[PDB]
Amino acid sequence: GFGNSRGGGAGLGNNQGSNMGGGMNFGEFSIN
Amino acid sequence: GFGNSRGGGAGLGNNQGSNMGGGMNFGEFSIN
Amino acid sequence: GFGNSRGGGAGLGNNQGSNMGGGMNFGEFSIN
Amino acid sequence: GFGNSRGGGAGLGNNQGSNMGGGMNFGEFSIN
Amino acid sequence: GFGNSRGGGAGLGNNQGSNMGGGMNFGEFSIN
Amino acid sequence: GFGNSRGGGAGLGNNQGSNMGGGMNFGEFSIN
Amino acid sequence: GFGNSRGGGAGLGNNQGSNMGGGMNFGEFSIN
Amino acid sequence: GFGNSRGGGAGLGNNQGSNMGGGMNFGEFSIN
Amino acid sequence: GFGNSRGGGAGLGNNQGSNMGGGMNFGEFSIN
Amino acid sequence: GFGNSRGGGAGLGNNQGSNMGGGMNFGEFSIN
Amino acid sequence: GFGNSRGGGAGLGNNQGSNMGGGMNFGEFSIN
Amino acid sequence: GFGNSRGGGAGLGNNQGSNMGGGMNFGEFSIN
Amino acid sequence: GFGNSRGGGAGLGNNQGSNMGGGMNFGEFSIN
Amino acid sequence: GFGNSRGGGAGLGNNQGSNMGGGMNFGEFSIN
Amino acid sequence: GFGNSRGGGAGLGNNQGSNMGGGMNFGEFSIN
Amino acid sequence: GFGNSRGGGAGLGNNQGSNMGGGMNFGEFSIN
Amino acid sequence: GFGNSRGGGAGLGNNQGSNMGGGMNFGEFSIN
Amino acid sequence: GFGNSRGGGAGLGNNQGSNMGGGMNFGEFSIN
Amino acid sequence: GFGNSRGGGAGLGNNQGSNMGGGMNFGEFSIN
Amino acid sequence: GFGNSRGGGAGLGNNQGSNMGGGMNFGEFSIN
C-alpha cells in the first residue's frame, strides 16, 4: 500500500462528570 | 492501494454527565 | 484502488446527559 | 477504482438527554 | 469505476430526549 | 446466535414521574 | 453466542422522580 | 460465548430523585 | 468465555438524591 | 475465561446525596 | 416542565468519502 | 424543570476518507 | 432543575484517513 | 440544580492516518 | 449545585499515524 | 465580523486524477 | 473579527494523483 | 482579532502521488 | 491578536510519494 | 499577541518518499 488508512481501536475524546465501568470492555480484543 | 481509506474501530467524541457501562463492549472485537 | 473510501466502524459524535450501556455492543465485531 | 465511495458502518451525530442500550447492537458486524 | 457512489451503513443525525434500544440492531450486518 | 439482540430486564426510562400507591411488580420475573 | 447482546437486570433511568408508596419489586427476579 | 454482552445487576441511573416510602426490592435477585 | 461482558452488582449512579424511608434491598442478592 | 469483565460488588457513585431513613441493604450479598 | 423535549443543534450521522467545508457554518449560532 | 432535554451543539458521528475544513465553523458560537 | 440536559459543545466520533483544518474552528466559542 | 448536565468543550474520539492543523482552533474559547 | 456537570476543555482520544500542528490551538483559551 | 466563515485559497480535493497538459493557474490570485 | 474563519493558502488534498505536464501555479498568490 | 482562524501557506496533504513534469509554483507566494 | 491561529510555511504531509521532475517552488515565499 | 499560533518554516512530514529530480526550493524563503 502507498498512503492508505484503516480505522481500528477505541477512543473517547472527552469524558466529564461520569461513572464509566461496571463490566466494561473498552479497547481492542483480537484472537487468532 | 494508493490513497484509500477504510473505516473501523469505535470512537466517542464527547461524553458529559453520563453513566456508561454495565455490560458494555466498546471497541473492536476480531477473531480469525 | 486510487482514492476511494469504504465506511465502517461505529462512532458517536456527542453524548450529553445520558445512560449508555446495560448490554450494549458499540464498535466493530468481525469473524473470519 | 478511481475516486468512488461505499457507505458502511454506523454513526450517531448528536445524542442528548437519552437512555441508549438495554440490548443494543450499534456498529458493524461482519462474518466471512 | 471513476467517481461513483454506493450508499450503505446506518446513520442517525440528531437524537434528542429519547430512549433508543431494548433489542435494537443499528448498523451494518453482513455475512458471506 | 451470532449477532442478534433481545431486550430484557426492566425497560428504558419507565414510570417517569409516576405516582404509585404500591404493590406493583415491574420487570422480567415470575411470582409463585 | 458470538457477539449478540441482551438487556437484563434493572433497566436504564427508570422511576425518574416517581413518588412510590412502597411494596414494589423492580428488576429481574423471582418471588416464592 | 465470544464477545457478547448482557446487562445485569442494578441498572443505570435509576430512581433519580424518587421519594420512596419503603419495602422496595431493586435489582436482580430472588426472594424466598 | 473469551472477551464478553456482563453487568452485575449494584448499578451505576443509582438513587441519585432519592429520599428513602427504609427497608429497601438494592443490588444483586437473594433473601431467605 | 480469557479477558472478559463482569461488574460486581457495590456499584459506581450510587446514592449520591440520598437521605435515607435506615434498614437498607446495598450491594451483592445474601441474607438468611 | 415534566418530561418534554426541544430539538436544537446540528448533527451529522455518517459522512464517508466527501469534501465538507469551504465556507461552512455547522452548529448552533445564538446571539442575545 | 423535571426531566426535559434541549438539543444544542454540533456533532459528527463518523467521518471517513474526507477533507473537512477550508473555512469551517463546527461547534457552538454564542454571544450575550 | 431536577435531571434535565442541555446540549452544547462540539464532538467528532471517528475521523479516519482525512485532512481536517486549513482555517477551521472546532469547539465552543462564547463571549459575554 | 440537582443532577442536570450542560454540554460544552470539544472532543475527538478517534483520529487515524490524518493531517489535522494548518490554522485550526480546537477547544473552548471564552471571553468575558 | 448538587451533582451536575458542565463540559469544557478539549480532548483527543486516539491519534495514530498523523501530522498535527502547523498553527494549531488545542485546549482551552479564556480571558476575563 | 463575529463568527461567519468564507472559503478561500485553493479548494478542497480538486483536480482528482486530472491529467493536465500545463499552463493552468489554480486558486485565488491575480495575474498582471 | 471575533471567532470567524477563512480558508486560504493551498487547499486540502488537491491534485490527488494528477499527472501534470508543468507550468501550473497553485495556491493563493499574484504573478507580475 | 480574538480567536478566529485562517488557513495559509501550503495546504494539507496535497499532490498525493502526483507525477509532475516541473515548473510548478505551489503555496502562498508572489512572483515578480 | 489574542488566541487566533493561522497556517503558514510549508503545509502538512504534502507531496506524498510524488515523483517530481524538478524546478518546483513549494511553500510561502516570493521570487524576484 | 497573547497566545495565538502560526505555522511557519518547513512543514510537517512533507515529501514522504518523494523521488525528486532536483532544483526544488522548499519552505519559507525568498529568492532574488
Q: With contact defined as beta carbons under 8 Å apart, do S22 and T24 qualify? A: yes
Task: For residue H21, give how far its alpha carbon lies from the nearest alpha carbon of chain N (Å).
Answer: 21
CB C2 within 8 A of CB A3: no
Considering only the beta carbons, identify the residue of G19, G25, G32 that sits closest to H32. G32
The alpha carbon torsion through R20, R25, R27, R31 (nearest 10 deg) reads 180
Distance CA R14, CA B22 (A): 45
d(CA L8, CA O13): 22
Query: Considering only CB atoms, which chain A residues are within 8 Å of S17?
Result: 2-3
CA L14, C30, B10: angle at the middle one, nearest 5? 30
How far is O11 from S30, CA to CA, in rounded Å? 38
Query: Collapsing DSSP states into helix, strand and coil, what is residue J32?
Result: coil
Give the other-Cβ count within 10 Å of D26's Cβ: 29
Q: Do O14 and A9 touch (CB under 8 A)?
A: yes
Q: At which residue does the C-alpha cell 464527547 appear?
A: B14
Query: Would you call Q19 exposed, middle or buried from its count of C-beta atoms within 10 A (0-12, 13-18, 19+)?
Result: middle
What is the DSSP code (8-state) at residue P12?
A: B
Closest partner residue to D5 (CB to CB) among K9, K12, K17 is: K17
Residue S14 to residue A3: CA distance in whole angstroms = 12
- What single-letter amino acid sits at S20? M
Resolution of the coordinates, Å:
3.3
Query: Distances from the Cα of Q32 to the Cαs of Q24, R14, R27, T30, in angstroms?
Result: 15, 25, 16, 16
Contact present, J and M (at least 3 Cβ pairs less than 8 Å): no
Smallest CA–CA distance from A28 into chain J, residue: J3
Measured between beta carbons, which residues in chain O are less than 8 angstroms from residue M8? 7
> How was this structure obtained?
cryo-EM
HSE toward the beta carbon, residue A10, CA cutoff 13 A: 20
Residues of D at the P interface, defined by Cβ within 8 angstroms = 2-3
Q: Cell 438513587 appears where?
A: I15
Strand O5-6 relative to strand N5-6: parallel, antiparallel, unpaired? parallel
Collapsed DSSP state (helix, strand, coil) of residue A16: strand
- Quick one: cell of D11? 454513526
- Going by C-alpha positions, the residue among N16, J7, O21 that lies closest to residue A10 is N16
What's the gap in Å between the CA of M4 and the closest CA on chain A? 15
Provide the residue count of chain B.
32
Cβ separation of A22 and I6 shorter than 8 Å?
Answer: no
- CA pair distance K6, L3, nearest whole angstrom: 12
Interface partners of chain H (CB pairs < 8 Å, 3 or more) are A, B, C, D, F, G, I, J, M, N
- Chains M and R physically touch (3 or more Cβ atom pairs below 8 Å): yes
Is the Cβ pair K32, L31 closer than 8 Å? Answer: yes
Q: Nearest 5°: phi and psi at Q2?
A: -90, -65
In whole angstroms, how far apart are CA F9 and each of B20, K30, T21? 18, 42, 69
Sign of the CA dihedral with J1 first, then J5, J7, and J8 last: positive
Q: What angle do CA F20, F23, F27 make, to 5 degrees?
A: 85
Asked if L7 and L28 count as a contact pair (C-beta separation under 8 A), the reply is no
**Residue reference for cell 522548499:** T26
User: What does H1-32 look like in DSSP terms, one character per residue?
Assistant: --S-EE--SS-BS-STT----S--EEES--B-
CA of S31 to nearest chain A CA: how many angstroms apart?
32
Buried b (16+ CB within 10 A) or exposed e, S3-28: bbbbbbbbbbbbbbbbbbbebbbbbb
Q: In what order do the strands lie in the sheet with M10-16?
A: K10-16, L10-16, M10-16, N10-16, O10-16
**K23 to Q12: CB separation less than 8 angstroms, yes or no:** no
Q: What are residue O21's DSSP bridge partners? A: N21
- Cβ I17 vs Cβ N4: under 8 Å: no
Edge to edge, what strands does the sheet with A5-6 contain?
A5-6, B5-6, C5-6, D5-6, E5-6
3-class SS at I31?
Answer: strand
Give the contacts of J32 (CB within 8 A, at least 6 positions apart). I32
Phi, psi dihedral angles at E16 (to 5 degrees): -125, 130
Q: For D16, which of L7, L13, L16 is closest by C-beta distance?
A: L7
Nearest chain T residue to S1 by CA: give it: T1
Q: What is the DSSP letter of K16?
A: E
Of O6, O12, O17, Cβ closest to residue A13? O12
Whether H5 and B25 have beta carbons less than 8 Å apart is answered as yes
Nearest-CA distance from N22 to chain M in Å?
5
Instruction: Give the distance, in angstroms, between the CA of residue S26 and the centroid of all CA atoms in the same chain.
Output: 5
Beta bridge partners of D11: C11, E11
Q: Which residues of B touch N10 (CB under 8 A)?
A: 14
